[PDB]
Amino acid sequence: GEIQWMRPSKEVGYPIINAPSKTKLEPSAFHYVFEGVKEPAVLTKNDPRLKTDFEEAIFSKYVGNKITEVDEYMKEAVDHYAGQLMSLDINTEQMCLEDAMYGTDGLEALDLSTSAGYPYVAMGKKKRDILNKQTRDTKEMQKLLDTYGINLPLVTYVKDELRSKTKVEQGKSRLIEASSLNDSVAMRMAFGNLYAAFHKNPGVITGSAVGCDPDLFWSKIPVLMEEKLFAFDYTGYDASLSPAWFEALKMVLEKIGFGDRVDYIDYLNHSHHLYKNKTYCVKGGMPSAFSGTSIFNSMINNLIIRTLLLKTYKGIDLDHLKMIAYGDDVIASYPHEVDASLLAQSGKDYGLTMTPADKSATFETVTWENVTFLKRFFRADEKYPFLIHPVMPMKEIHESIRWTKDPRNTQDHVRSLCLLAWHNGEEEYNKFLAKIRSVPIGRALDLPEYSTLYDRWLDSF
Ligand code: NA
Numbered sequence: 001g002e003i004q005w006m007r008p009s010k011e012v013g014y015p016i017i018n019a020p021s022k023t024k025l026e027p028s029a030f031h032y033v034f035e036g037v038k039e040p041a042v043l044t045k046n047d048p049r050l051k052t053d054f055e056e057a058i059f060s061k062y063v064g065n066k067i068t069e070v071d072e073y074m075k076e077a078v079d080h081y082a083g084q085l086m087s088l089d090i091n092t093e094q095m096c097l098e099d100a101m102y103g104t105d106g107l108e109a110l111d112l113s114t115s116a117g118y119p120y121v122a123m124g125k126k127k128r129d130i131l132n133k134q135t136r137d138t139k140e141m142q143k144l145l146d147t148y149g150i151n152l153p154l155v156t157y158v159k160d161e162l163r164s165k166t167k168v169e170q171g172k173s174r175l176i177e178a179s180s181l182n183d184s185v186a187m188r189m190a191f192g193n194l195y196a197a198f199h200k201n202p203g204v205i206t207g208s209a210v211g212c213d214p215d216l217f218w219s220k221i222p223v224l225m226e227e228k229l230f231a232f233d234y235t236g237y238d239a240s241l242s243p244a245w246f247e248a249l250k251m252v253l254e255k256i257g258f259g260d261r262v263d264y265i266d267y268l269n270h271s272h273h274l275y276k277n278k279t280y281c282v283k284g285g286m287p288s289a290f291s292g293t294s295i296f297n298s299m300i301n302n303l304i305i306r307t308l309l310l311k312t313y314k315g316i317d318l319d320h321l322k323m324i325a326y327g328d329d330v331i332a333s334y335p336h337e338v339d340a341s342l343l344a345q346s347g348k349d350y351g352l353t354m355t356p357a358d359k360s361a362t363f364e365t366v367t368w369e370n371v372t373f374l375k376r377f378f379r380a381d382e383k384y385p386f387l388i389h390p391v392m393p394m395k396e397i398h399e400s401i402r403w404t405k406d407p408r409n410t411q412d413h414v415r416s417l418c419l420l421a422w423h424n425g426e427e428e429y430n431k432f433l434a435k436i437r438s439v440p441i442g443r444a445l446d447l448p449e450y451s452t453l454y455d456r457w458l459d460s461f
Contacts, residue, residue: 001062001239001285009279015122016277019157028404029441036402038162041173049168057171058158061239065284066351074248077306080318081299082255084205088197092257095192097138100185101131106196106211109133110184114289117155117180118274119148127181145182151267152180154287156275162399177273179290188291190261194253198295202324207302209326209373210294214390215419216460218378222368222388226322226333229366232340235353237328238286238297242351243269246284248303249296268296294327301325305332308346313338324373331373339363379423387461389423394432397421401436411445422453429453 009016023040045054070078095104103109116127130140157176167173179187188195199211204224209217234240246269250262268290271282286297305323309316316334323332341363344354356363358372368378376390397417404410414436422429429450436442448456 001241002064002283003059003062004281004283006278006280009274009277012279014118014153014274014279017118017121017155017274019276020160023160024405025160025162025403028402028410029439030436031402033435033438033442034398034402036399038164038399039168040403041159041161041163042168042171043158043160043173047168047171050171051169052171054171054173058173058175061175061236062282062285063236063240063353064351065242066349067242067244070244070247070251073307073310074244074303075251076310077303077318078248078251078255080306081207081302082252084207085252085256088201088205090197090256091193092260093193094260095189095196097142097185097189098136100188100192101138101141102133102136104192104196106200107188107192110181110188110291115155115157115176115178117178117184118153120181121155130181141181141185145185148180148182150180150183150186151272152183153272153274153279154179154290156273160405162403174288176289177271177287179287183267184291187264190264191258191292191295194256194258195292195295198298204322204324206298207323207325208295208298209324210298212326214374214376215457218376218388218390219386219461221324221331221373222378224322224324225331226320227335228337229331229333229368229371230338230340230343231331231357231366231371232344232354232363233357233359234328235355237301237352238288238293240351240353241286241300242284245300245303245351249300252299252303265296297327298325301328301330304347304350304352305330305343307350308343309334309338311349312342312346326374329374331371337365340366384458387458391423392420394421394424394428397432410441414442414445415447418447419453422448422450426450 021044023043025040042050042054047054099107101110110127110131112127112131115121116125116130130144154177157178159174159176161174163173198206198208202209202212202217246265250265253259253262253265268287269284271287273280273282286293302323302325306318306321309318309321320335321332323330347354357366371378375396376392379389379391381387381389397420401414401417404413421432433447436445436447
């Protein structure tokens with residue numbers, strides 16, 4: 001990803017976009033009951049905590065484009081992945097406006113709380129004013145599609161979330177690149193069935209985990225993985241993607257019956273963005289908030305890993321590459337041991353910056369004991385080994401519970417954390433509940449006890 005140019009929006013015919021400047025994150029009733037070191041991300045260039053230029057920091061993720069065209073290894077990767085996806089008999093017909101808007105089997109309705117993007121955000125028009133969940137009315141949307149068309153600028157907002165102290169000082173805030181509601185709708189109409197097929201088929205065939213339920217999926221993953229696991233982290237994955245990776249994605253789409261609308265991919269690759277009073281053009285880089293971000297990043301990850309394996313290990317048997325991606329996150333395997341360090345080396349030539357799994361300083365062997373996926377470890381249940389626990393460390397949960405974005409959601413927020421935490425065991429879960437109940441807010445919540453969650457879990461399979 002690389003920014004071609006950036007300049008005042010008015011110079012290119014666009015209005016200034018108002019973006020919040022104050023975090024909605026504030027210390028929760030549990031702020032001093034649990035340990036934590038994260039704080040709300042910087043949202044404005046004048047944040048006191050900043051120790052470097054803000055604008056430069058948030059856009060530094062665009063490290064450039066290392067590759068121009070699709071080489072032979074990538075083409076091979078494309079053929080293998082596409083051939084694999086072919087076995088799913090994915091429905092290639094366009095999805096009707098109604099379902100694209102309000103959902104159908106395998107595709108949730110459009111999120112009504114998130115930005116409607118340009119130009120709606122500039123006309124003070126919300127999604128709630130356009131969509132009718134009980135009516136499933138498409139008239140207003142259709143009228144808007146005809147009026148403002150598609151391929152509209154993506155509206156950039158700084159993401160309001162917790163970040164390490166280092167990332168706050170270095171202005172390393174993440175960005176939300178919201179595609180207009182029109183584009184989102186058009187893309188779900190174009191690829192709606194592809195998305196549904198992926199959501200209904202998490203595993204090693206789609207090579208994707210999007211739409212998965214960790215509580216149930218964790219027990220299925222091992223049986224899908226090979227003998228030897230391998231994994232690694234990406235530094236700024238989305239933004240590092242070069243145009244060639246988007247072209248490779250289109251080839252996959254053409255081969256599986258969607259050649260009909262690969263043009264939509266161009267809109268993602270060569271994209272137009274609005275931020276505050278500036279507009280900028282990016283070549284490469286996956287936009288962070290459009291309908292399909294996760295899925296397309298996952299598909300591209302499948303192409304990347306196959307490519308690096310072909311480039312590094314000629315003769316590799318991709319039919320025995322078993323991987324599951326979720327955007328940039330990935331858990332992979334092969335019958336034979338592979339060197340992630342070598343793969344990482346091959347990765348640089350493709351514009352990818354790969355580092356040791358889970359922030360290790362060195363590339364170590366990945367085992368079922370130390371591997372993580374979506375920040376969750378895998379642990380066989382003590383009583384029924386065949387049931388696998390997705391174990392998210394308490395550290396993350398403690399960090400999260402120390403802040404709130406709305407006192408009215410305290411109950412939901414804390415229940416959510418409980419669904420993640422109990423997997424750490426009864427002793428730990430009870431210590432968590434007790435601390436929660438050491439303050440009034442926590443004592444007034446209705447939280448499930450350990451045995452309740454365990455029973456609920458066994459009854460969910
Ligand atoms: Na882009």
